[PDB]
Every structure is written in C-alpha cells, then in structure tokens.
Amino acid sequence: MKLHELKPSEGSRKTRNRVGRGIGSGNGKTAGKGHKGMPLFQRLPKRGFTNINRKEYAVVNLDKLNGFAEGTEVTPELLLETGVISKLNAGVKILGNGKLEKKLTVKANKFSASAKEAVEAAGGTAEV
Amino acid sequence: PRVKGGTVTRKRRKKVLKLAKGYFGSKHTLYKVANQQVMKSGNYAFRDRRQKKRDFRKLWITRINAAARMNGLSYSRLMHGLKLSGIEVNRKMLADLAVNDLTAFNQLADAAKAQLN
Amino acid sequence: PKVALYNQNGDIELNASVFGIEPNESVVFDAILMQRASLRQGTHKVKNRSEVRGGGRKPWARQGSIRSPQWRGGGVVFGPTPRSYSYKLPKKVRRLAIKSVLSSKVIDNNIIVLEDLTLDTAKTKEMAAILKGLSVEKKALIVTADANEAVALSARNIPGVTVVEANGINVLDVVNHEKLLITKAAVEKVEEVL
RNA sequence: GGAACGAGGUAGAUGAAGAGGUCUGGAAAGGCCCGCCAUAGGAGGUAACAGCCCUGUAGUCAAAACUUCGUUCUCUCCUGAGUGGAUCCUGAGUACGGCGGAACACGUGAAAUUCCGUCGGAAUCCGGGAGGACCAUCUCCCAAGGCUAAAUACUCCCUAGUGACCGAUAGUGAACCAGUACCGUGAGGGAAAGGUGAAAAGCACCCCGGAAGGGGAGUGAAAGAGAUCCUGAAACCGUGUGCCUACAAGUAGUCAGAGCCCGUUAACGGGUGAUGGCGUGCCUUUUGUAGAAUGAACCGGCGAGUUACGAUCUCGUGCAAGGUUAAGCAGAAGAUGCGGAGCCGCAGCGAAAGCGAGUCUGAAUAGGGCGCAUGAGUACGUGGUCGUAGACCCGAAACCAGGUGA
RNA sequence: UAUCCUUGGGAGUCAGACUGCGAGUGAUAAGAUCCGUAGUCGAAAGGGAAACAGCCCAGACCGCCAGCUAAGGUCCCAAAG
RNA sequence: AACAGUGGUAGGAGAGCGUUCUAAGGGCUGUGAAGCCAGACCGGAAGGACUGGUGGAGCGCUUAGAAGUGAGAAUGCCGGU
RNA sequence: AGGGCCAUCGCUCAACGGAUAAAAGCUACCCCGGG
C-alpha cells in the first residue's frame, strides 16, 4: 500500500450530519427538533428476597468433551488451562445436554442425573 | 483549528450584486435589499415566460380576425372552416406571417368559403 | 519469499507464511490511522463563559452578562478540549498489518536483504557510498537486529534515511519509505514476534 | 560529629565544507550548470526561498567561588541465645450502663460501628476483645503511650522543549509605558490602541502661502512609500460623460418592444430603454397575512447541536463456541512488545434452598408459565438517538454566605 | 390492479379552519358552539367568481414566438358569434 | 432498452460543493504568488476557471484525515457611515 | 432475631390511574412571563 492512495472501505466511514447549517441540507431552521418540544414499575410489587451466598458452578454442555484428545485425568485445572471453562468459580457442574463419545476421566463438584449415566455409558469415571 | 472564513463571504455576496446591476435606487448596492429582488426576479421570470406563450397567441388572433374581416368572415367562421374544408395545420404565428400579403392569405379564405357553403 | 542476498560489493528463502501472505488493504488503512492519531498531541484549551476574567453584573436587548458568547471578547461556548486521540486495536489486527505491509513489498521487488551490514566507523562518507551501490535514491529503511552504534550514527544526517532496531518496526516506518535494507540476521527476529 | 572523591547546577570555550560558474534582478539564499563536508541538512538572521554567508548545532572539554547529590575514611555509639515456672505487673471515671446528639453508602431502624456531651461503672492471663440484634460453639488478635521515609496530589515560579494551538473583534483583561486611561465616597468595575524602508538615504534647494498644505527638484527598486506610513473592500460623499426624463399614479421588477450608442472570454452580443401585459417586500409565528401581530437605518467583522463517561442500534473489519486485556514496566510524552487479575458469551427456571434440556406451579406422571429443542457472539472504528454533567445558544424576579457605605 | 403484515432504527403531531348533508346548546340568533361523513386549505401554485387561504375547474422536472379541450365565456376595456 | 414517474412544510433517507490545518508526490512562483478590482466564459445546483489592471511574497493540485465548518434576521455585541 | 413464600385485615385515596404522613387567607405601591 502506498500513502497517496488510501481508499477506505466502503461504508466504513460516514460524514457527520451537521445540524442547523442552512435550509438546503434539511434540519435547517428548527434543527430537526420541531416547534415546541404513575409509571408501570412503581405498580409492580417487589419479589421476595436474595440469598447472601449463592454457589454457581461452571457448566459445560456434555458436548465440550467431544473435542478432546483422550478421557484421562480430566481435572478442572486442565479445563481452565485449555479454556473450555473461562473461569473456575465455586464448583464445576456437568450438564447432560448433548451426546458423549469415548471414556474420559471427569472430576466435577456436582453432576446432573442425566449427565451421570452418559459418561458411565461411554466408559468414563465420575469422581466428585 | 480556528477557521476565520472572511474571504468566502466576499465572493458570494458579489455574485448577487452583479445580477442586480441596473436596478433603481438603493436596490443595487445593498445586500439586504438586492437579495430580496434577485429572488422576486427569478420568480417573476418563470411566470413571464409562461405568460409569454399564451400572449403571442392572443396577438395572432387579432391580426387574423382583422385580415379575414376584409372578406366578411370572422375568426370563428375561419378557424372552424379551415379545420374541415381542408388539411392546413397553419400555425397561429406561422399564418400571421403570411397574412401580410393580400393574395396568399386570401387563398385560404376562398377555399374555406367554398367549404362553408 | 525468494529475495536475493546483498553484501556491500557483491537468493534466500523467508517464511512464506509471514512474508508471502496475500495482503488485506482494509487492515492497512485503519492501522495507519491508529498509529497517526497517537502522534498528535491535543493541547488546545480554549476559554469558556465561566473561565473569563469578566463581570457578573447585569450592565443595564437584555444581556444579563458582559462576557456572554455573543459579545466581543469572551466566547467559545464549546471549543476544542484537550483529550486523548489514541485508541487500541485488537492484538491480531496489529499483528496482521505488519505482515501485510512486509508481504506487499516482496512482490514489488523492493525489499533488499544485506548480510549483517558491517561498517568501519561512524563516517557518513562510507555510508553515503554504500547507498549508491544499492541505488536507493529517495527514502529508505535500515533494520538491524542488535542496534549497532556505528551504522546508527553514520545514518542520522542523510535526509531520506532513518535507522532503527528490529524490535521496533511498525506501520508508518515501512509504508513511508518504499525501499528497505534488512540485515539477514534481522530477518529471523521479525518472524519470532509474529 | 569532620575532611576526601566523583557527578551535576549557576558565566562559557572549541566547532567541519563553495565569493563554484552563469542568467534575471534594487538586491541571489532562486533558475541553469557543477562541486563539497556531515557524530554537524535542529533553529535564527542576512537586500528574495542558505548545509557550506554569519550567530550557531552535533560533538568533545571547562568554574577560582558557591552550592545539590552520592562514594569513602574519620567520627559516634553498641551483647545475644537458652532454661525453667514460685510472685508481680502489661498503659482506669478508663472498657462498658442510661439519656441526648452526630458521623459511617446506612435517614434509629432488625441493627452493630465511630465520636461527642450527659450521668453511672469494671475486669485485669484461669485474662480480655472481635467475628452486623442476642446466646453457646470456634477461629484469629492484645485496647485505653508515642514515633516513621518511599510509591501519591498540586505548582506563583526556574531552565530545556513541544504543538493536526491562536495570529491583533483572536490569544490572557493587557503583543503597544494595563489593572493603566476613565467610572465610583467606597468595596469594586474596566477599555481602546500592532506593521515606512534592505537602511533614514526621513525630502538641500526653487516656487505659492502668515503658517499649514501644496507644485517641481532630489533619495529610493516604488513618494500612487512622506510619519496613524504594507495591502487596501463595502456603506457614504463627489466630479466627468454615453442613453433616457417636465399630461405623469408605479413593492419599482419581469416579459414583449422600437429608437439611438457602443464592439465582446464572438457569442441566438453589450448599455439605455418611449410604450403594452402581469405583479399586495423579506424572516418569524399562527386555523390563517399585504396588516394596523413581532424584528431589522445601512455596510463590515464576530455570533448557536460540542466533548468526556455510560447505554442501545446499523454498517465495515478481525477472529470465531471464544474472543479480549486493565493498571504498570521496557520504550523519541510514539508505535510496538509483556501483563491472564478481570469482563462478556457458551443453557435455563425458581423467592430461595435447588435441580437442569428442562424447570417452576400443583395430589398430579394433568394443564399451563418460561426455556431450549431450531445455537453466534465478541473486540475495535464510523454513524444514528437516549442518558448524567452549565449539554443548543440568549433571556428574569427572588434566595444564601462573606464584605463596603450616615 | 400491487399493495399490507412482522420485527428493528428515526421521528413529527395532540386548541385546526371553512364550504355541501339530519341534530344538540342557543331564540333551528350568530364568519356562535359541539358532534359525526366527504372535500379542499393546512403543506397547492395555474384558469374562473371585479378583488378574494377553505367555493367551481385542474395538480407546476425544465425549455419551445406548437396544437386540443375544462369551468367560465364571445359589442368595447379584454382573446373569441 | 422499453414503460411508468418527478407540488410540497414538519420529518426520514441518499448524493455532493466549499473553507483552515496535517501527512504522502508533484509544481508552480520576483519574467510577479495570496488578496483586491473589472469582464459578454464553463457546470443540473452549492461553485469553478481564463485574460486585464493594481499588488510585491508566498501559494496551489491529487488521495486521505481532523474540525473553533458555510450568516440576512437575537428590541444581537463592537467598529464605520 | 428478622425477612421471604401462601390464607387474611386496615383507604370516603370520594380532587375515585391514588404529587408527600402533614398543610389557611393575605396584600398592591405590588417583583416578574403573558391579552
């Protein structure tokens, strides 16, 4: 690329609509604003309370183990390194949405009941 | 950056005050008043031109209506008789130019008179 | 990736996945603006209706203040504010642009590889004669991997030239000069960062 | 407690290479044609645009005297560790009790906590306090004595330097003998005003006149450059001269149109126009204007949708079930590296416990609510609105605090 | 004949006026008021009603010294018996 | 290429011209730049050129980019008449 | 302890889509935006 001919991308730039400069462009005199220019949420009652300590573990579609090399020593500190989980919080929960493939050692805080059998069917271990 | 922009208002205000050259009085030196007259000048020119097309047709009638009145025929018995007797789409302004002569203009009246009877 | 080798008086193969990429010239337009905006400084501070050493008394149309902006001294309701004109690209977009500007000059027979660029002293006469041998009439670039003081001090006066290290090449350096001399040892180190 | 040693600061010294040739010019720094130095083509001057014309810059070296930092001697002062386990202390109107207040994001409440007064009042290693009223359990920690640098905040100033800053209605109120001239008893308010030329070479003399101010002559490249003086616009005031004008009712124009008078970015030209037709100024505001509804004496300058931080939306770009770093450090106040703390997404429902491709509701495996099933975000950039900030400009009466005046 | 639904972005408007139909208030008084249907004006010039925001006729992209018609008209001002 | 269309305020969308500065190249200028004054030229508009006179040292083109961005109206302000 | 979640009470809020728990005239020589 040379520095003379810097053609931008089409539609990547736009000129500013400058408001109030002359009647020909539109927005001429009144500047696009025209001449002389209980709510609902204060009728809906509040909803119980909130818990001071909710424990939300990291959940991963059963389908996250379908893209891994071999079901062995699948510890959460390897889930967090490769980054299938973006952040370890309280615990790592496994969900039973999806189909499994081979056997893979799983180490999780909790387990769904439908998620428990699908690793127990492929040949994996569920160590909590 | 600050943009002064004093040099672009000289050239724009001159181009109005050239178009107002020849007007009476203070209406050809003052920008506040000449700009009110170049506007009403262009607006009057649009109407003048449109009225000029319907005027000259008003002129060509009153010469045909006199040149035919030498032979007893009025304009009505002429125009109406020239659209049935024969095929002569002679234009109002085109026929008025040939109305000056006795002979060429009367040659149509005689033909229309024969078709009128 | 088949540029020839030069050596003062007197062909190699570079990473084709670095120096032989098809360019993406949209990524070279926005990348230049991000490197040019930072250059500017933005130190223009104008005065306002409240920062003028002026009155607050209604003097006598209405005109409740003397230094209101429709008067003769003291205006600029909005004016230029000293801000920051430097935004950030995502990292791969910064990485893609340096590959695109280098690969473009491979095609145009513009890059020239040297072997280690050894000088005798910091003389400009010896450096000026070296430029004639390589026929670089307008601006150039000299990229050296170890920041030799000799070459750097011998090419700081000639107007079109500009010396710099290999860990500090960026977009407006290479896009501005249209000829560039690299030491062959520096060709490795640009591949390692990207 | 003192002297050495080194680095600076406050004054400076040194410093490379063309009268190149020729043209035009009042004058070469320009053109044309030829060289040179460069750790030095950053600047500023010079009769017009200098790399080699000066003053300078890079570089290396310098301060007797003052200081500002460090390095070093001298000087100055100087016990630590066990082991026991018999008695003492370990910081009192104090910790806490009541009343009344006040401050913590918290408005006296469910409410610790802190600090005031006001009244009472302890305990002291087997001891004491805390862990959001309170009580047991349990972990951490010793109150009521005092000291302490660094990393941080802002600058009237002082050198060195920058601008996608302004260039005389701007920029500070002030480029000029400016907080001055003036206004006010006073507190206070508060302007206007830049440019001869490369130099004074700033008009000897002669003429008119009382002098001003002229007309010649001289200087000068230019006197149309002669002291408020570069350039010199428009309003306004005039003097010449082509064509109309003393029976004519007119938002003053436009279209038709002779007649005379001129020759042009040569073109279906230019300037006037006797006479005929049509024709209720401009902006604002209103159901609506010619209005007697509002505004402008005219000319010239100045004079109104901005920027931060958020929110959302479209387009472009990068990567994509994964994208992205912040502060900070190394870097010409720059790009770029490096930083994986954090954020958004990848699956929800429920008040929550919770369970989960479903889950709440309910005797319910019913019905229904929501949700997948049918899945694309994210980071930057432009742009469109909405927020919060004086928020688009201009425009009150009053209010409070601190002051000046019989 | 070619429109209208859905989501999404941006709005403006919220005392309308009079002319042709049956009322109400009023005195079937009012360029009065308030209704409802249609029109025009609002935001629409051109032709006609002597002049006329709303009535009758018709919708202006711009040129032309072209033609045919609409309402209304044809002694003269003023085109046409 | 044939058919259809083009009144218009609030308001929505799209395409453009100018001004100062900055970056890249390319190039006018003392044999006369900006500015100022005329003129019967060119473009659908905002606007561009070209000769002539004054002027006596700077300016412009192409592609981009940033805005203190474009005046006839404020019982606007300052100057001049 | 206290709150959530269901059953249930207290409103003439009567200026009934409910400005706060709480609230009168007054004065013109009147201050001021408007006919």
Side-chain angles (χ1 to χ4, degrees), chain C residues 101-102 105 110-113 136 139-143 174 177-182:
Chain C
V101 175
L102 281 167
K105 294 188 177 291
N110 289 351
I111 64 166
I112 286 184
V113 184
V136 175
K139 302 173 178 289
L141 261 179
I142 289 178
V143 173
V174 287
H177 289 248
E178 293 177 350
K179 293 179 179 179
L180 62 80
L181 318 173
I182 322 291

Coordinates of all heavy atoms in Angstrom, one line a residue, chain C residues 101-102 105 110-113 136 139-143 174 177-182:
Chain C
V101 N 2.1 -5.3 5.2 CA 3.0 -4.3 4.6 C 4.3 -4.9 4.2 O 5.0 -4.4 3.3 CB 3.1 -3.1 5.6 CG1 4.2 -2.2 5.0 CG2 1.8 -2.4 5.7
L102 N 4.7 -6.0 4.9 CA 6.0 -6.6 4.5 C 5.9 -7.5 3.3 O 6.7 -7.5 2.4 CB 6.5 -7.4 5.7 CG 7.2 -6.6 6.8 CD1 7.4 -7.4 8.0 CD2 8.5 -6.0 6.2
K105 N 5.7 -5.6 -0.2 CA 7.0 -5.2 -0.8 C 7.9 -6.3 -1.3 O 8.9 -6.1 -1.9 CB 7.7 -4.3 0.2 CG 7.0 -3.0 0.4 CD 7.7 -2.0 1.3 CE 6.9 -0.7 1.4 NZ 6.8 0.0 0.1
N110 N 11.1 -4.7 -3.9 CA 11.5 -3.5 -3.1 C 12.4 -3.8 -1.9 O 13.2 -3.0 -1.6 CB 10.3 -2.8 -2.6 CG 9.5 -2.1 -3.8 OD1 10.0 -2.0 -4.9 ND2 8.4 -1.5 -3.5
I111 N 12.1 -5.0 -1.3 CA 13.0 -5.3 -0.1 C 14.4 -5.8 -0.6 O 14.5 -6.3 -1.7 CB 12.3 -6.4 0.7 CG1 12.2 -7.7 0.0 CG2 11.0 -6.0 1.2 CD1 11.8 -8.9 0.9
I112 N 15.4 -5.4 0.1 CA 16.8 -5.8 -0.2 C 17.4 -6.3 1.1 O 17.4 -5.6 2.1 CB 17.5 -4.6 -0.8 CG1 17.1 -4.3 -2.2 CG2 19.0 -4.9 -0.7 CD1 17.9 -3.2 -2.9
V113 N 17.9 -7.5 1.0 CA 18.5 -8.2 2.2 C 20.0 -8.0 2.1 O 20.6 -8.1 1.1 CB 18.2 -9.7 2.2 CG1 18.7 -10.3 3.4 CG2 16.7 -9.9 2.1
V136 N 19.4 3.5 -3.9 CA 18.3 3.9 -3.1 C 18.3 5.5 -3.1 O 18.8 6.1 -2.2 CB 18.2 3.3 -1.7 CG1 17.1 3.9 -1.0 CG2 18.0 1.8 -1.8
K139 N 13.9 8.0 0.1 CA 13.9 7.4 1.5 C 14.2 5.9 1.5 O 13.9 5.2 0.5 CB 12.6 7.8 2.1 CG 12.2 9.2 2.2 CD 10.8 9.4 2.7 CE 10.5 10.9 2.8 NZ 11.2 11.5 4.0
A140 N 14.7 5.5 2.6 CA 15.0 4.1 2.8 C 14.7 3.7 4.2 O 14.3 4.5 5.1 CB 16.4 3.8 2.4
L141 N 15.0 2.4 4.6 CA 15.0 2.0 5.9 C 16.1 1.0 6.1 O 16.4 0.2 5.3 CB 13.6 1.3 6.3 CG 12.7 2.2 7.0 CD1 11.4 1.4 7.3 CD2 13.3 2.6 8.3
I142 N 16.7 1.1 7.3 CA 17.8 0.2 7.7 C 17.4 -0.5 9.0 O 17.1 0.2 10.0 CB 19.1 0.9 7.9 CG1 19.6 1.4 6.5 CG2 20.1 0.1 8.6 CD1 20.9 2.2 6.6
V143 N 17.2 -1.8 8.9 CA 16.8 -2.6 10.1 C 17.9 -3.5 10.5 O 18.4 -4.3 9.7 CB 15.5 -3.4 9.7 CG1 15.2 -4.3 10.9 CG2 14.4 -2.5 9.4
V174 N 7.6 1.4 7.6 CA 7.8 0.7 6.3 C 6.9 1.2 5.2 O 7.3 1.1 4.0 CB 7.5 -0.8 6.5 CG1 8.7 -1.4 7.3 CG2 6.3 -1.0 7.3
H177 N 8.7 4.6 3.0 CA 10.0 4.7 2.5 C 10.2 4.0 1.2 O 11.2 4.3 0.5 CB 11.0 4.2 3.5 CG 11.2 5.2 4.7 ND1 12.3 5.9 4.9 CD2 10.3 5.5 5.7 CE1 12.1 6.6 6.0 NE2 10.9 6.4 6.5
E178 N 9.5 2.9 0.9 CA 9.4 2.2 -0.4 C 10.6 1.5 -0.8 O 10.6 0.8 -1.8 CB 9.0 3.2 -1.5 CG 7.6 3.8 -1.3 CD 7.2 4.8 -2.4 OE1 8.2 5.2 -3.1 OE2 6.1 5.2 -2.5
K179 N 11.7 1.6 -0.1 CA 12.9 0.8 -0.2 C 13.4 0.5 1.3 O 13.2 1.3 2.1 CB 14.0 1.4 -1.0 CG 13.7 1.6 -2.4 CD 14.9 2.3 -3.1 CE 14.7 2.5 -4.6 NZ 15.8 3.2 -5.2
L180 N 13.9 -0.7 1.5 CA 14.3 -1.0 2.8 C 15.4 -2.1 2.8 O 15.3 -3.0 2.0 CB 13.1 -1.5 3.7 CG 12.3 -2.8 3.4 CD1 13.1 -4.0 3.9 CD2 11.0 -2.7 4.1
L181 N 16.4 -1.9 3.6 CA 17.6 -2.8 3.8 C 17.5 -3.5 5.1 O 17.4 -2.8 6.2 CB 18.9 -2.0 3.7 CG 18.9 -1.0 2.6 CD1 20.2 -0.2 2.7 CD2 18.8 -1.6 1.2
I182 N 17.5 -4.8 5.1 CA 17.5 -5.6 6.3 C 18.8 -6.4 6.3 O 19.3 -6.9 5.3 CB 16.3 -6.6 6.3 CG1 15.0 -5.9 5.6 CG2 16.0 -7.1 7.7 CD1 14.4 -4.8 6.5

